[model samples]
Target: KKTILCFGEALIDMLAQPLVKKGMPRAFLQCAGGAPANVAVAVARLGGAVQFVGMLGSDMFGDFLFDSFAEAGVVTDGIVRTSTAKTALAFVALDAHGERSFSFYRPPAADLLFRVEHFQDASFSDALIFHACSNSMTDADIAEVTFEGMRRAQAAGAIVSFDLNFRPMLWPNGENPASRLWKGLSLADVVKLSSEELDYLANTLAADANAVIQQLWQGRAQLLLVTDAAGPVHWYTRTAGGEVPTGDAFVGGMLYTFAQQFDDAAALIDFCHDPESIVSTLRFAAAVGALAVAFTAMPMLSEVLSLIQEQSE
Candidate 1:
């Protein structure tokens, strides 16, 4: 099986309770989560071969972490547990709507201790794909590690996938993250991003969600992933003969890509005939997005792919 090597921090997520800001608090929820780790689990749970590479503390928390990996069947062999430092932890605030705001608890965390050389043997040597998040690019050393790791993985002929999971605070001097995010996508073969991500990084506003994603991806990601009212999905890319285009979406077609629905009849007709429409044109664009969130939890790829098959049938 081809492998996905997810490199970066592995930590505990402390999700706050919806206390009235009055009581001391109800039960605090504990979930094993981190962006890269969550993506690794997302892939693993979806019937993909995933490996997690990071540093951990040689403590009970680390022991529990190993156990968690074993249960999930994610390869933890690349994880290095050391006694000198501790595994990273994040404190998150979830409002009544379940929206999240995060505060990190790492003081020069273990993930920062990683060196680019270690990536050679641990990840770039054999994986078919590699994934890392913006947090991995928090500092020069870590950025160098991720940059070279990405460059090396591509150099080794692997398809590189990235999640544009940006945290603005990670930048030292209040640097707006678009330029850096674009730099990362320039190296990616596939990328998973939302409407806001496309807007923030691409400097293009998508009046319709999926169109923006599809346009941003033309010749960018072998596949660009976006979620809208339909469900979780994958997209196709197009480029004009060796030159990569900076794709764009203008709500109505005769331009742009992906499925869309508009109140105007001409826009609807144009969208129907648009060359960029995939899977029976625009009829099913975001109905899938709506279907996805109907689940009790955020449905990962396994559920999405199986449903994709069922929907096809």
Candidate 2:
């Protein structure tokens, strides 16, 4: 079985419970969040083994996050705790259409302070899929850790996966995030980005969409997925491919399928040589996403396999 090592922040997301209070806002709910962290849990929930790698404060919120990962069946050995800083927190506000806005409380946060000395050799050891998101690159020191760690994981023969979970607020006011994001994207074998994110990177870099994408193809990435929220998923490969739209629940789901089905990047490329594999995988992922939307729950591996069977028939 393949394992995934998901890297980066695992902070608390305090969501507004009432959706709308109309008057002075009152209640909120503390939930587990952060993109790579959620992806790690999503993989585990769908029958894939995963580990989380990041730093957390020696505080209640950090304890909550640690327990959250353990409860979701994610391995926690890669995590480190420090008492110097407190855990990062995000206070979320929801608008009329279920979209979320956030007020982040960091800078003196533990998640932003990972260092080279913090890494263990065992963190990148063995056969596994190493995953990360752009949120980890907010600060220069943490960005160094993020880049070097992924490089080390790749050197150790792990498939490096990157998710461009771009948040404008995380970046410094004068610096364009694309400058750092492109570097991280180049180190990945698999990349997941939203259409808006792609555009943001491109616009920031003064380049067109296709040019930025072509750059990834020219670099190390083999499988690139561009998704629109609740819209069709667009894909490009180093090999033969055409555009195919699919439902949501992707990114993590698609990466899970790739890691579970293929042993390495070469195997992933070989699988793409057969067009049917790509189509089937997309259909299976789309079905999983659609079902999650319909049921408001993440499906099990058995449930996913049944949908694959239906796609076959």
Candidate 3:
């Protein structure tokens, strides 16, 4: 079986409502988010065994986040409850069409309170994969710990997966996050980004998605996947041929076909490899990303995994 142990921040995401309440127009809709948190849930929902590692405040909001993780069928043994910081919360204002932008209240948040000792070698449980996100490195204190976790996990022979989810505001030192993300990517077995994110993170301005992914692949990333909204997905590798997946929010069939294809791909690979082998791993990872686009904010739909299994058979 394949196991993914994802580590990073978790927070309450408050989406903006349409109508005005008093002077403020945006109302709040609650959900769990944070890039790593989203990835953790996304993997579990797709039938991949997963564990979450991070700090959460010992508060009600923290309890809610923990409950959300539990509800998603994720193991929480790596989570630490910190007393010094408050839990993180994001207040988002979505556009009229259901897309969102956010302003966060994360000062002294549990996410920033991360320490190296909070994680233990025992937590690195012989999983097939480990994932890291950019937010885990925002603070001076937590940056080394998170990076070390990725390094340590990779040394253990787990394929390291990274998503260069860039947030410029988080890097207070004014260091280039684009270059910084690549340092982490040099250690990754699989990497993913939006076409936009690739240009931002890569040293060269790629003429297109294909160029961006190929350059990153040459730099040590084995699997380079990028999502293009309304356009086709671009997946390429130096060792493998390119594969594309298209999105059609117009008909809403893109997401369905993606899930269906992944389930089938896994079984096909399982015959040549294993049910949850590396070949199926990449397909599942990409499927989770596409499924997240299908569902609202994050793909934490614990109940939707039947789609993967049903299609596999």
Candidate 4:
């Protein structure tokens, strides 16, 4: 079976409970998360052959993340445990209105220390998809390794899936994220970004959303997805585009389909262009995303199929 390689950070999300009083002590619930890590787990939980490539601190949090991947059936051969830095942590505080605020404890995190040399033995020959997110691009060194991996994977006949999970807080003070992100945009076969990110990029380029879409379409991206939280997802192909409901799990579903059903990127692109197949595939992906949102855990392949079945009926 073909494998999907997901490379990036895997960290603990410390979610703060709602405080009833001003002076009350805050309580946190730890959960395994990080954009690319979630994608790896999503693919694995959906029964796809997947591997996680990144570094973790030789600490308890790293152990927890490693165990999480093992439990999810994600291959951890590409993961390295280092004593040089501590595992990254994101403290998620929720407001009364349920708005989330994230404070990250990173910069000197172990994942950022991941280099191309770490995974030199890992073969990309059997990779159906090479997936990553912008979170790994915060540092210059890691960004270089990430872009190199994307190029190598694409050369080895793997589809490059890039998600612009932009967290402005992750980037440094002087760094321009839009400029850096645009480089990744040009290397991807499939690109996913939130609508807000689109606006950020559009504003940076002094253009509109349609103009940015045109620019992306003219690049190497065969498919570009713009997601609006709880709203419609706008997807653009080479010759056409449309909207559907959301998911990062949606990317997993699509990647699962690509790894299992198609032999190459050309075949996948063809599927994207065909009206019937595009809608059917997106609907399947939408179901996966819906399930991810509905439950605390990542949904299984059976759950996604059942949801799609019920929706079809």
Give all TM-scores, in the order shown. 0.66, 0.87, 0.73, 0.88
* Candidate 2 lDDT over residue span 1-313, tens digit each: 2678888898999887773547866788898878788887777677677888899889999999999899888889889999989888888888658787778887668998878878778767754788899989988888989999889988888888898888888677798676689899999988888888888878765889887778888778988878776666677787655655431246567666777787764686676567777777865665553332224444556666676689779
What lDDT is obtained when candidate 3 is compared to the true structure?
0.65
The Cα error of candidate 3 at residue 13, in Å, is 0.8
Model 4 vs. true fold: TM:
0.88
Worst 10 residues of 1 by lDDT: 247-256
Order of candidate numbers by lDDT, starting with the best: 4, 2, 3, 1
Question: Top TM-score: which candidate number?
Answer: 4
Please report, as a residue range, the 10-residue window in candidate 3 with the lowest summed lDDT.
Answer: 246-255
Supply candidate 3's per-residue lDDT for 287: 50
lDDT of 4 by residue, 1-313 (tens): 2899999999999999877788988789999988899988888888889999999999999999999999999998889889999999999898548688888998889999998888654558778889999999998899999999999888888889998988889899887887769888889999898888899989988989987887887767988888887687777888888876335777777777668777776676787778666766776676654443344534556766676689799
Please list the Cα RMSD from the true structure of every candidate, rounded to 1 decimal place. 10.2, 3.6, 7.1, 3.8
- Show model 2 residue runs off by greater than 4 Å: 19-25, 94-100, 245-248, 289-313
Report lDDT (Cα) of residue 120, candidate 4. Answer: 53
| Number of the candidate with higher lDDT, 2 or 3 | 2
List pairs with backbone clashes in candidate 4. none
lDDT of candidate 2 vs native?
Answer: 0.78
Q: Quick one: how many clashes does candidate 3 have? A: 0
